[model samples]
Target: AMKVKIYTRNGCPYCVWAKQWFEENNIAFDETIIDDYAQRSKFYDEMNQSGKVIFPISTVPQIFIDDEHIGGFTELKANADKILNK
Candidate 1:
């Protein structure tokens, strides 16, 4: 199965929406809560692994589909099907 990963801070609204959206669409994803500031350093490299994107990974609801950065909730909705099919 293609991998979907989401990094959320606290219980962000958009992040919650994303989880529900994936569920609604029957897309499986791994959502990780990132509240430990000290541990955030490890994530920076992962987010930039695929190079800097238009949206980059700068927010609470940062999302990635199949190891590709897919932006936030609004952006995810726009590319949901394409992402799943990939």
Candidate 2:
């Protein structure tokens, strides 16, 4: 099994959708919301990139598998089959 993390935020429909997608596929994952200052800082430090914190773009919903950056939902969807088979 691969370890996965999803950085998210409250009141974001896409975040909910992404979670649901993972759940439906039975992909075990950990989530961290960037709505607070602490979480935002942590994600920025982890990602080490500069820019606005945008859901699935800037910060929220960054998916990692086995410590490898697999990008967001769109990228996940594109590679879902291969990932699951692994």
Candidate 2 error regions (>4 Å): 37-42, 49-57
Shift in Å, residue 2, candidate 1: 2.4
Could you give the C-alpha RMSD of every candidate to the true structure, in order shown?
2.7, 4.5
State model 2's lDDT.
Answer: 0.73
Determine the backbone clash count of candidate 1: 0
TM-score of each: 0.73, 0.74
Top candidate on TM-score is 2
| Worst lDDT 10-window in candidate 2 | 50-59
The TM-score of predicted model 1 comes to 0.73
- Candidate 1: residue 32 lDDT (0-100): 86
Error of model 2, residue 21, in angstroms: 1.4
The sequence of per-residue lDDT tens digits that candidate 2 reaches over residues 3-81 is 8788788987777877898899888889977788686766667576544323334555677777777777787788878
